[PDB]
Automatic annotation (TrEMBL):
Source organism of the structure: Bacillus sp. N16-5
Residue ranges annotated for the Pectate lyase domain, each copy included: 23-250
Protein name per UniProt: Pectate lyase
Gene name, Swiss-Prot/TrEMBL: pelA
Family from the record: Belongs to the polysaccharide lyase 1 family.
Residue ranges of coiled coil: none
Region described as Disordered: 1-20
Gene3D superfamilies in the record: Single-stranded right-handed beta-helix, Pectin lyase-like
Keywords: Carbohydrate metabolism, Lyase, Polysaccharide degradation, Secreted, Signal
InterPro entries, A to Z: Pec_lyase (IPR002022), Pectin_lyas_fold (IPR012334), Pectin_lyase_fold/virulence (IPR011050), PEL (IPR045032)
Chief location of this protein within or outside the cell: secreted
GO cellular component, one term: extracellular region
PANTHER family: PECTATE LYASE 18-RELATED (PTHR31683), PECTATE LYASE 21-RELATED (PTHR31683:SF18)
Annotated localization: Secreted
């Protein structure tokens, strides 16, 4: 199971120990979710193995709607969506978790998502205990030069909490990852762990964090054009044993004055977030300015490699076709 925050609050097992299904179209995926929700046992664990290319053309809605059929006020629970080999592909259609609890999304590629929310995985409406593991997410960068043509790769909003994002590749994208969509503390997600991810050839938002407590360890950040970790409005991010290579423009942010780099306060929001920095390695990545502004340490046990050991493990084992 997951390390970090998704292991808390009862842990995350997704759809282990229940029904198993294969799907090759978005219609089959959506029908499985909706059929279960209408059944006499809506919470029975369900694992859907994705073997084929899920598209707009083969799906009944513009996104894959992991939401209780009655509406987002009610929980949906205990699902795993797992790709088969290198064949679990979502091309131009993303997944939305709304008030979804105990969910695993693993070994899939989700890419070029413009329609729907325009984001590969959106975690929203008080979803909790979600493990996003060993996936590949991408679009284009610079692509056609429009940062908004595609939206996010993995975004969290509206009080989503206890989430671990691990062993994924995020590549070729403008607005990579958001935690909290607006400066509204009452809607802020919280308690997110990112570890062993490959963040490569991205413009910004790695992640954009508002309010939340976040732990980022053992990730490999590479070729990030503008800024990486952006900590805003009282966020606390413990940035631990990550490897950064060519990350940040080095320019003074025209709004906050902060040097654009691996971690800081950039672009907006009325007040800064905080960071606790330990054991990171910075290659061609501005860092002479950088000191810890919080002592924040996450409440869970975990294992953590050196930054250089993490770089190598991420290179070898992140992304799809590894766990299946």
């Amino acid at each position: 199971g997951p390390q970090g925050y998704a292991s808390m609050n009862g842990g995350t097992t997704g759809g282990a120990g229940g029904r198993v299904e294969y799907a090759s179209t978005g219609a089959q995926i959506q029908q499985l979710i909706d059929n279960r929700s209408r059944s006499n046992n809506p919470d029975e664990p369900l694992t859907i193995y994705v073997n084929g290319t899920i598209t707009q053309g083969n799906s009944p809605q513009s996104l894959i709607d992991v939401k209780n059929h009655r509406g987002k006020a009610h929980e949906i629970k205990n699902i795993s969506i797992i790709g088969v080999g290198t064949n679990g592909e979502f091309d131009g259609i993303g997944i939305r978790l709304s008030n979804a609890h105990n969910i695993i999304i693993q070994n899939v590629s989700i890419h070029h998502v413009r329609e729907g929310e325009g984001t590969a995985i959106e975690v929203t409406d008080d979803s909790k205990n979600v493990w996003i593991d060993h996936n590949e997410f991408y679009s284009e960068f610079p692509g056609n030069g429009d940062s908004d043509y595609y939206d996010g790769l993995v975004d969290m909003k509206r009080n989503a909490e206890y989430i671990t994002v691990s062993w994924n590749k995020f590549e070729n994208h403008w607005k990579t990852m958001l935690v909290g969509h607006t400066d509204n503390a009452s809607l802020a997600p919280d308690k997110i762990t990112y570890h062993h991810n490959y963040f490569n050839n991205l413009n910004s938002r790695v992640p954009l964090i508002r309010y939340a407590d976040v732990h980022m360890f053992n990730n490999y950040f590479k070729d990030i054009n503008d800024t990486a970790i952006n900590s805003r409005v009282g966020a606390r991010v413990f940035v631990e044993n990550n490897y950064f290579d060519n990350v940040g423009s080095g320019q003074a942010d025209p709004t906050t004055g902060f040097i654009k780099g691996p971690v800081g306060w950039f672009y907006g929001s009325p007040s800064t977030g905080y960071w606790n920095l330990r054991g990171n390695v910075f290659v061609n990545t501005p860092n002479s300015h950088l000191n810890s502004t919080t002592n924040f340490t996450p409440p869970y046990s975990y294992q953590v490699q050196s930054a250089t050991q993490a770089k190598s493990s991420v290179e070898q084992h992140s992304g799809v076709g590894v766990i299946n």
